[PDB]
Design a protein around this ligand. Structure first.
Ligand SMILES: NC(=O)c1ccc[n+]([C@@H]2O[C@H](COP(=O)([O-])OP(=O)(O)OC[C@H]3O[C@@H](n4cnc5c(N)ncnc54)[C@H](O)[C@@H]3O)[C@@H](O)[C@H]2O)c1
Ligand SMILES: NC(=O)c1ccc[n+]([C@@H]2O[C@H](COP(=O)([O-])OP(=O)(O)OC[C@H]3O[C@@H](n4cnc5c(N)ncnc54)[C@H](O)[C@@H]3O)[C@@H](O)[C@H]2O)c1
Lengths: 355, 355
């Protein structure tokens, strides 16, 4: 029923392909990947296409899954749209707002579905927190806060992930937390500030990205947010906190657990699908796709496949299909990048209104 | 040997008096406080003076202890210096850099001691962290981070503490954490940004201060810091974290404990003088002067008294006597206040060059 071609079958694209193939009436018919396509095509018993054009124009393809490096997402999406193929694109959708808007527009004009692969929206704990927030259990929302802070040792080989021009750095490569804040609040920030530096990953054998980033967001409703990322933190933390007038929620990914705190009493909830998934994630942080992420890939590919088969998306995920989550995440990231580069606070209008 | 007059004997000034009277050759001879001076002077068996001038000009006074509301510190210090009296002043020293400089200059010109009451420098765990940092055990320092975040309910009577013009809000009233970052790094920031809002403490019966503040500091050495405060947080945290290349330190005041994390392993140390003091502080946070603070008042008053009796100050505390801790804390606070008021990042030069 739905045939898929995968552009980029490295670590994550190969997993997307394996999990998609598990769904009834879904089939990976081909891949395009100069370095890894031969091996993956043999594993999947599909065709290793000799060029991007051969894949996106193939009659064997109904939907193109894009899982190339972050700076290489645009051409596969634009060419898929030109060939009237549906598109799933991994995060970050692109490394500039102009590129992201061009991608959304191309799919809109071609009349094809375009899904942004913002997988954190599918976390059990994120869905649940959103419902608690919406129902009013923590009152009016006042602020959100994220951290994604750890220590990365020098690596034997330097990969594209550490090069700002290829990955976008922590902000774009780990854009999940920023998209999550905007998803939970349902607003885009009017003013964006970001400070950062390369404090311990500068010199031979290292990339050129900042290894600490400290962002502050101000929203038109008056709500506020802070977001931190980096790879130079010997005090590790990884969380989203939502503060309301009646209580607060923490989605802790490091010491994996959700907490709902009301009247100084705390109730536990799951981040992932089961306590086993949360416990495994926590054990691994203390200590090659982990269980929690495998389950999410299965769920996200199933969502995509069901949409292409005609299902109506639940309201939680509509912004993944209309371009709004992608454009809003990249817009704020672009504003933060400008703020860091130009040593100033940035109005989101500078990004959204530039052209 | 040393006679003290206390201007402002409310909660904290009365405690300063009681603890100072415990030291050999120290005596509180008088107080000035229209509302509470009668009661406290009876308790302390001393004179309740009828005016500030009568206290600062009294032959019964060698040193004036200033513990009035935050906006009422300047005149007692200026007049003490005019009368050649030594001065101890509670934090925040003043609510503007101009006032702080005037106070430091007046005492210098009069040849009297001026001590800034930045009591957090006396915490056992702060002293210990300074020694760990200096010896090199966490490597090169990269960043610092503070939070002082809790929930304050609507109070029966609205006090000066909640009025920005009287307390200076969280930043000045709880300036300890900012002074601590500057003390631990031994540097002042080049650029200061602060965002904030009054998210849940606006309207009849409430003050006019922001109830959330989010500050970012950039130091010319490349070091970075974030600092948060507020009274609208239903996820409470209170800590200082120092991140270095070899390890990190957390001084957690809420779940009261010091942590030194190196090579993935954490070693505990005390925040306060004894495990009893840390245990009791932690137990009280789950739920009038607590043990940890009583010990600090005893220690800080003993330090002042010993200095006035001729002792050489420990290197850790010299900046409480040469004006530097007071001026540097207030300069950064003024820069942050300007950043919040004018919606922009502020260079410290804008503040400190204005003399
Ligand atoms: N949503 C998630 O949880 C998640 C997790 C990991 C990675 N990702 C995303 O997946 C994408 C790929 O990341 P990864 O970890 O698999 O990286 P990877 O380096 O393991 O794989 C990238 C693949 O792209 C191939 N490639 C390079 N240039 C190509 C080109 N012009 N055309 C076709 N293929 C090309 C490479 O040969 C390689 O196989 C990124 O966008 C990344 O952010 C998402
Ligand atoms: N270092 C610390 O740990 C710590 C702790 C608490 C308070 N403080 C500081 O101590 C100072 C006082 O705070 P507090 O908690 O005692 O407040 P408080 O409101 O309990 O006491 C203030 C006192 O000042 C009196 N006063 C008002 N105007 C006066 C005036 N013109 N002249 C003389 N007295 C006047 C008031 O009558 C009252 O007794 C503040 O600067 C505050 O920031 C420091």
């Amino acid at each position: 029923m739905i045939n898929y071609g995968v552009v980029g079958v490295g670590y994550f694209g190969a997993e997307l392909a394996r999990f998609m193939n598990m769904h009834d009436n879904a089939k990976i018919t081909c891949v395009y990947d100069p370095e890894n396509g031969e091996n993956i095509a043999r594993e999947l018993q599909c065709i290793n296409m000799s060029s991007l054009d051969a894949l996106v124009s193939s009659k064997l393809v109904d939907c193109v899954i894009v899982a190339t490096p972050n700076y290489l997402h645009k051409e596969p999406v634009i060419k898929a749209a030109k060939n009237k193929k549906h598109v799933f694109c991994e995060k970050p959708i692109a490394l500039s707002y102009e590129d992201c808007v061009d991608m959304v527009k191309a799919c809109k004009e071609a009349g094809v579905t375009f899904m942004a692969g913002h997988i954190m929206n599918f976390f059990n704990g994120v869905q649940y927190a959103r419902k608690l927030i919406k129902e009013g259990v923590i009152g009016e929302i006042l602020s959100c806060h994220t951290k994604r802070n750890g220590w990365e040792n020098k690596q034997e080989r330097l990969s594209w992930k550490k090069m700002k021009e290829q990955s976008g750095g922590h902000l774009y490569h780990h854009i999940h937390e920023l998209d999550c804040v905007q998803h939970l609040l349902g607003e885009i920030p009017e003013t964006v500030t970001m400070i950062g530096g390369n404090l311990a990953h500068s010199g031979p054998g290292f990339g050129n990205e900042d290894d600490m980033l400290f962002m502050t967001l101000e929203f038109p409703s008056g709500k506020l947010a802070t977001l931190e990322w980096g790879s130079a933190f010997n005090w590790p933390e990884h969380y989203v906190i939502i503060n309301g007038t009646k209580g607060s929620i923490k989605i802790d990914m490091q010491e994996t657990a959700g907490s709902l705190r009301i009247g100084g009493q705390t109730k536990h909830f799951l981040v992932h699908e089961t306590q086993e998934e949360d416990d495994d994630r926590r054990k691994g942080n203390m200590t090659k796709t982990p269980l929690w992420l495998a389950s999410l890939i299965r769920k996200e590919t199933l969502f995509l496949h069901n949409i292409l088969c005609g299902a109506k998306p639940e309201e939680d995920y509509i912004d993944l299909l209309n371009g709004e989550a992608a454009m809003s995440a990249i817009a704020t990231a672009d504003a933060a990048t400008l703020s860091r580069s130009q040593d100033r606070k940035v109005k989101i209008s500078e990004i959204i209104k530039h052209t």
